[PDB]
């Protein structure tokens, strides 16, 4: 199996286009990325009309030969780290599924489904979505998995659409210690009220930042806005090494000090924050209180 977004349920072209690893490796958010992708497809020899068909109806001979095609072509672009070994579950004549696809469907179903009062309503719809995902586990239901798969497609599309805008506008400010970016205004901001969706976006962003010529591993701070509450949701993200790296430089995983920094600043100053997430690296802050708080975080020992 390969690091591909819903390979067995979307066309191979869209799979390569939305796969985060290929995105990071070849910069598909501008034109040269698409040109290199088309060159790769041509050198493989799959037609652009063929590669844009569903995996079921796509040609059987090249379905069989896909492994050899990848082995012989991917070396030039250096994407050979996309091939791995995984698990596949088959139930009679129903079809085939894989662990990565199933967990992505579950994650998307958790994300999307169906002042204090609004916060309580959000926290209760989160539990409702959790129970819906739980019920989706059993093998007697598949209409709660097809919906999850299509919603995963939609969510990944929206995340890509927002990330291309971020990297185009160059909102990533490089401070002395830690990078910072704030989504002041844009599209589809209402989706990012979910911490897991925000983490997915941040994971893609940190992958993109890592897959560059920069040799600095800096923590990242990301913020959002919901005009209904007039609050900023802030999450701290750790740097990540390139996936294709040896294990010798893996003595200790990169730690996360953001929870300690947040608790120390909240203890020493009377900010209007609300630290109640089980993930201690995610806090809520006020719009007027954000900027001085950030200053403090800059001036504090990390």
């Amino acid at each position: 199996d390969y690091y591909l977004f819903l390979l067995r349920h979307s066309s191979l072209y869209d799979s390569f286009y939305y796969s985060n690893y290929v995105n990071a490796k070849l910069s598909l958010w501008n034109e040269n990325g698409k040109k290199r992708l088309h060159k790769m497809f041509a050198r493989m020899g799959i037609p652009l009309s063929t590669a844009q068909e569903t995996w079921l109806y796509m040609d059987h001979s090249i379905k069989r030969e896909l492994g050899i095609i990848f082995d012989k072509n991917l070396d030039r672009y250096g994407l050979q780290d996309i091939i791995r070994d995984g698990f596949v579950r088959t139930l009679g004549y129903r079809g085939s599924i894989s662990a990565s696809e199933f967990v992505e469907a579950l994650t998307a179903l958790l994300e999307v489904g169906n002042s204090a009062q609004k916060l309580t309503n959000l926290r209760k719809r989160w539990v409702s979505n959790f129970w819906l995902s739980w019920d989706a586990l059993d093998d007697r239901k598949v209409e709660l998995l097809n919906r999850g798969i299509q919603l995963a497609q939609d969510l990944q599309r929206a995340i890509f659409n927002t990330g291309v805008a971020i990297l185009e506008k160059k909102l990533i400010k490089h401070l002395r210690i830690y990078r910072l970016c704030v989504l002041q205004d844009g599209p589809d901001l209402d989706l990012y009220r979910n911490p897991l969706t925000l983490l997915r976006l941040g994971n893609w962003l940190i992958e993109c930042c890592a897959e560059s010529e920069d040799k600095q591993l800096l923590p990242m701070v990301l913020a959002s806005i919901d005009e209904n509450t007039d609050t900023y949701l802030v999450a701290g993200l750790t740097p990540r090494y390139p996936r294709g790296l040896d294990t010798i430089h893996t003595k200790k995983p990169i730690l996360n000090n953001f929870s300690m920094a947040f608790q120390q600043i909240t203890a020493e100053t009377d900010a209007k924050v609300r630290i109640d997430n089980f993930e201690s690296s995610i806090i809520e802050i006020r719009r007027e209180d954000l900027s001085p708080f950030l200053e403090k975080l800059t001036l504090s020992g990390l």
């Binding site: 060159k39 041509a42 020899g45 037609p47 805008a165 185009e168 599209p187």
Partner: protein, 662 residues
């Protein structure tokens, strides 16, 4: 085997055709052609054909284009061979093209097995009248107008037969697209009998034949045109459209006919043209800027230079100053025209709301203001240009019309003028004198972008994306400043409101302005005087020196820039001032008809948005910035201000100074 190029100079057989097919000759020709297209260095020191192959691989199309003069400058004997014997040359050249292409893309054969090489521009040009006996079985270059297009049908490429009287399977056979394969002795048995086609193992092509007349601007006056038939093989299908002027490079061939010999009493033969390359020549008659099948297409380095020069400061200033470098003044028009020919982004909300994304422009003023020259330059500039004038266009002419087919004997639709303008511009001269029945028919074309016909039992709806640029003259031949716009023209609100940018140009008496204009005009006349390495490149550099003194950038680069900007870049609009634009629109709703005469509606707000999007397009940016919004609002407010009476012009000008503060 002496595989030397010089040995091809002297022929050993009686004719060229029987000498080319010689086994010794063919392989030498193939290897020389290979060494040509693998190594031909352009002026930049890089093989242009390498870039051509890369682009073809990216686009996985079915046509590789070879410049003729490139082949002429090096290995000219092969150019002569191709000019005299096309059939025996093109096959070998296709084979070497496949070899070269799979040198870059191995296993590309799964995409396509063969290629159809096209020649760019032959040196000699013939018209339909100057066709003789000698120019047969050789390349010709014919200009014409398409009249009747047949359609798309499949063909047989590799024909095989099964002879059942002996059970003999015949080998694959070709076809020449105007004959029938006739087999006499039926393979080794040497016996005549029945056989079947058994086309379960066969491969298909598709062709399309069309009627080619003479260009009405080329025929001698008061004479009649000469028709010919053109057959279009695979990959050239539907490239040509009815009603357009085209130029075709092809092969002239002859064939026998029965009824032709019947009606004349003499052994006369029919002739058809097998198309080999097609180049559109509608509107854009300036055919000296560059060569090639398509002048609006770009190479990769041209895209790189587009990106490089799209980022410098004040690029909009250079672009606006680089349009019509032979007309003095009229900065506002020089800006409105650019904003009109870039256009906006069409908007589709949920598939149930449609917002037009193109800008109309109207000009108005006294005679002698060079409006027609601007219109001519616009026609020369855009990718799709349609020119009309005054009484010379009827309402049913601009729009599609219902016609009865004189052969198939029923009704059918005929493409109107606006249909050719789809994805392009339609230019109207003398807008005011056109009869109102000929004027009211384009409301949907301006606004809804749709054409609907319910005539003679046919109920269909077409599609038209056209930007209308019009010019006219006010009542009495001169614009009276002390009257509102309602008493200066005969148009009404419904037609006026559809126009986004409306410019009024006045003729006024001045001293130093007249002196400067006269100096510029005289220097322009003395500049364009016909009497002031390879000769052609020295001519080209002289032309470049002549052009660089008034235009900041060369025009062919500008045309390719226009095409690139219209094709790829799509701006997006996020960070715009809600209250600023809302207050501006409220202010324009105030005053206006409530104090004056000019009508203002919600469509002008969409016009402001579209102008801002166009300004964003000018810089090859995906996101609108605030400066572009400022420029758009400045243009709109200025256009509204300078269309009022002189009694209130200064007062309104000082009133509106806060939104365009800058």
């Amino acid at each position: 085997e002496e595989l030397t190029l010089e040995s091809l100079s002297n022929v050993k057989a009686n004719s060229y055709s029987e000498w080319i097919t010689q086994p010794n000759v063919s392989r030498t020709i193939a290897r020389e052609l290979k060494s040509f297209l693998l190594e031909y260095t352009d002026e930049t020191g890089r093989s242009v054909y390498g870039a051509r192959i890369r682009t073809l691989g990216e686009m996985n199309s079915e046509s590789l284009e070879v410049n003729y003069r490139h082949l002429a400058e090096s290995k000219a004997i092969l150019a002569l061979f191709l000019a005299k014997c096309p059939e025996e040359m093109l096959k070998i050249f296709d084979l070497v093209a496949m070899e070269a292409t799979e040198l870059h893309y191995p296993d590309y054969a799964r995409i396509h097995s063969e290629i159809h090489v096209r020649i760019s521009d032959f040196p000699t040009i013939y018209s339909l009248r100057e066709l003789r006996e000698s120019n047969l079985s050789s390349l010709v270059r014919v200009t014409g107008v398409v009249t009747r297009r047949t359609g798309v049908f499949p063909q047989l490429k590799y024909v095989k037969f099964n002879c059942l009287k002996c059970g003999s399977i015949l080998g694959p056979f070709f076809q020449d697209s105007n004959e029938e394969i006739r087999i006499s002795f039926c393979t080794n048995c040497k016996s005549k009998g029945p056989f079947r086609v058994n086309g379960e193992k066969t491969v298909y092509r598709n062709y399309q034949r069309v009627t080619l007349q003479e260009a009405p601007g080329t025929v001698p006056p008061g004479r009649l045109p000469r028709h010919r038939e053109v057959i279009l093989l695979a990959d050239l299908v539907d490239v040509s459209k009815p009603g357009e002027e085209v130029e075709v490079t092809g092969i002239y061939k002859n064939n026998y006919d029965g009824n032709l010999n019947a009606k004349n009493g003499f052994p006369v033969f029919a002739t058809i043209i097998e198309a080999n390359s097609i180049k559109r020549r509608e509107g854009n008659t300036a055919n000296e800027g560059e060569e090639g099948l398509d002048v609006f297409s770009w190479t990769e380095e041209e895209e790189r230079e587009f990106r490089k020069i799209s980022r410098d400061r004040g690029i909009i200033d250079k672009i606006i100053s680089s349009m019509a470098p032979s007309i003095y003044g009229h900065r506002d028009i020089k800006t409105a025209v650019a904003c009109s020919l870039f256009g906006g982004v069409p908007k589709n909300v949920n598939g149930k709301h449609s917002i037009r994304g193109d800008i109309n422009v109207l000009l108005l003023g006294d005679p002698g203001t060079a409006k027609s020259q601007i219109l001519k330059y616009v026609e020369k500039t855009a990718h799709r240009a349609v020119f009309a004038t005054g009484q010379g266009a009827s309402a049913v002419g601009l729009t599609a019309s219902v016609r009865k087919d004189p052969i198939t004997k029923e009704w059918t639709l005929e493409g109107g003028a606006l249909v050719l303008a789809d994805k392009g511009v339609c230019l109207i001269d003398e807008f005011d004198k056109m009869n109102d029945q000929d004027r009211t028919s384009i409301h949907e074309a301006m606004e809804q972008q749709s054409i609907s016909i319910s005539k003679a039992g046919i109920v269909t709806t077409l599609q038209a994306r056209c930007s209308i640029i019009a010019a006219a003259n006010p009542n009495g031949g001169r614009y009276n400043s002390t009257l509102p716009l309602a008493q200066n023209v005969s148009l009404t609100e419904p037609i006026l409101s559809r126009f986004d940018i409306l410019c009024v140009v006045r003729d006024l008496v001045d001293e130093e302005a007249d002196e400067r204009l006269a100096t510029f005009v005289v220097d322009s006349h003395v500049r364009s005087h016909p009497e002031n390495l390879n000769a052609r490149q020295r001519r080209l550099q002289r032309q470049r020196k002549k052009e660089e003194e008034i235009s900041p950038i060369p025009q062919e680069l500008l045309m390719k820039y226009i095409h690139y900007a219209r094709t790829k870049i799509y701006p997006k609009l996020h960070q715009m001032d809600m209250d600023k634009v809302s207050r501006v629109y409220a202010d324009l709703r105030r005053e206006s008809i409530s104090t004056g005469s000019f009508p203002i509606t919600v469509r002008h707000l969409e016009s402001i948005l579209r102008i801002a999007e166009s300004f964003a397009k000018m810089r090859l940016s995906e996101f609108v910035s605030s400066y572009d919004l400022d420029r758009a609002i400045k243009v709109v407010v200025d256009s509204f201000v300078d269309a009022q009476k002189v009694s209130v012009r200064r007062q309104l000008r000082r009133s509106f100074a806060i939104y365009t503060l800058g």
